[PDB]
Design a protein around this ligand. Structure first.
Ligand code: CA
Ligand code: CA
Ligand code: CA
Ligand code: CA
Ligand code: CA
Ligand code: CA
Ligand code: CA
Ligand code: CA
Ligand code: ZN
Ligand code: ZN
Lengths: 316, 316
């Protein structure tokens, strides 16, 4: 819409109050004109037709419980855009300030959220397994990172390349959660998963086996479910990335951590310069080593820690 | 695009030559201005970003092997629009002549095709399990019927309502295949599935158990895979619809067939007037009986055959 840029206030899914960028033109819309070509949030009104209607509000205050998922989708797309711009100098997901669109209230009792190739879609959850999925900043950033991957490496969504695609989304989702300093951790989806159980999450990067996912290449899933294990086999790369960052000893192999910032620079470089649509785990290892070499020198500690981490999860 | 409407010629996936509606404006585009607000076909160029580029061609002749999937997506969306308009008086999927958009060459070796809530997406297959999926008119019509369902009943995509949603798509996909008189049958996907094996298909409506899907409510799948069995449990409704149309005796129960035309009028009415997002199989049976009653009278043979068919598959 064409209108005047302004700032409204609301409450997110977890009850926290935040300011959000809106646009006024008769109604106040969730349209943020301060980032790129804009961030737009739509109401899918419990249907599956997309994108739905651009979210319109009469008084620029979003404290209704129906508003909550929209406030967080809109705000956490802004935080994720800021992370990529400020940290990696990337303007939106295509590198050219493409508009970011999200729809909330998709379907009824839908326990998922996804990037569909053109926009973000968030279910409200069934209220038992999940609450509205845009309340999790790592979920929002995980999904928006699939848009980045689609425009750069183009990793296909199955077998080892799909597992890399999922891991890259977990890694950057977690780095955005640390960037916003929102009670950060190495788990995925813990703010919106099972409201009735404390302490769990959908997946763990620090210990993937907690939830039964593999933490070593010898335990990888080889069947056909889950598009050849894209959500399952991503545990192997998540654990490598946690070790590169944090260090540790894993199956016998000791890794010195180099921190989150360098982890993010190495993987971002590997993703935008060396990975291709059919890259497998062994070519991820080569790409990460080459990236760390480009950035820090072939005899750095950074290169040595990337090698040790992939050796620790059995990826040669 | 704005340009002059014209007609081009090409070859589809199976090698058949057909005329297609195009638009000229420097290049010839796959843009059909003769149906509703238009039918538009895009090239996703082996990526997953959608919709891709509107398909442009220099000389209005589409005989290259890269063109084939586009010719058939474009042409078979036109046939499906014509079926719904001519048979059911429905203008496009929203009933208001919404533009129909499709992208072909999505990803690499992708063995599927789907309606994503805003447009059709077709993989090229891996060449072993499938060939480009827009070569199957029942696949194209199956997916475009999810758009109709989304705008009318709004059946959620899981458990029994998702199974109904899938069956409704198989039924109408099959009726469009009979309307175009394209070697018609009651199987789904046989023109594009496994190029190396003759005679098989993805699913069968006349005998779902051929491929292991249930043909009776007592054999339904009750686990969590496939969103609670939406592609598996649709066999129960597919068999009922085949019996209503064709007649037969099934587990003890005899059904007099009333034909395809009445099958289509009954289910179309049930879908647009009585089903809701959470309808289950028993409420489908009530909706189909009420529809047949509205159309033919409570003491017709048509009402009696709908009851016998649902009784034959164990749905009360
Ligand atoms: Ca308000
Ligand atoms: Ca956290
Ligand atoms: Ca987290
Ligand atoms: Ca929990
Ligand atoms: Ca040509
Ligand atoms: Ca056929
Ligand atoms: Ca068929
Ligand atoms: Ca075959
Ligand atoms: Zn993902
Ligand atoms: Zn379907």
């Amino acid at each position: 819409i064409t209108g005047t840029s302004t700032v409204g206030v609301g409450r997110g899914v977890l009850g926290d109050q935040k300011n959000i960028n809106t646009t006024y033109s008769t109604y106040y819309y969730l349209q943020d004109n301060t980032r790129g070509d804009g961030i737009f949030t739509y109401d899918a009104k419990y249907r599956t037709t997309l994108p739905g209607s651009l979210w319109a509000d009469a008084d620029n205050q979003f404290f209704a419980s129906y508003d909550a998922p929209a406030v967080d989708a809109h705000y956490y797309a802004g935080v994720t855009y800021d992370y990529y711009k400020n940290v990696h100098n990337r303007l939106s997901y295509d590198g050219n300030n493409a508009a970011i669109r999200s729809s909330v209230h998709y379907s009824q009792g839908y326990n998922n959220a996804f990037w569909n190739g053109s926009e973000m879609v968030y279910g409200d959850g069934d209220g038992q397994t999940f609450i509205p999925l845009s309340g999790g900043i790592d979920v929002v950033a995980h999904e928006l990172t699939h848009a980045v991957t689609d425009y750069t490496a183009g990793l296909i969504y199955q077998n080892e390349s799909g597992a890399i695609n999922e891991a890259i989304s977990d890694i950057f989702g977690t780095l955005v959660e640390f960037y916003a300093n929102k009670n950060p951790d190495w788990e995925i989806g813990e703010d919106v998963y099972t409201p009735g159980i404390s302490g769990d999450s959908l997946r763990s990067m620090s210990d993937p086996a907690k939830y039964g996912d593999p933490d070593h290449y010898s335990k990888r899933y080889t069947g056909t479910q889950d598009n050849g294990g894209v959500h399952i086999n991503s545990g192997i790369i998540n654990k490598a990335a946690y070790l590169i960052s944090q260090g540790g000893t894993h199956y016998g192999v000791s890794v010195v951590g180099i921190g989150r910032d360098k982890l993010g620079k190495i993987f971002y470089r590997a993703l935008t310069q060396y990975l291709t649509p059919t890259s497998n785990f062994s070519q991820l290892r080569a790409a990460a080593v080459q990236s760390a070499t480009d950035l820090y020198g072939s005899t750095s500690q950074e290169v040595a820690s990337v090698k040790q981490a992939f050796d620790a999860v059995g990826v040669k």
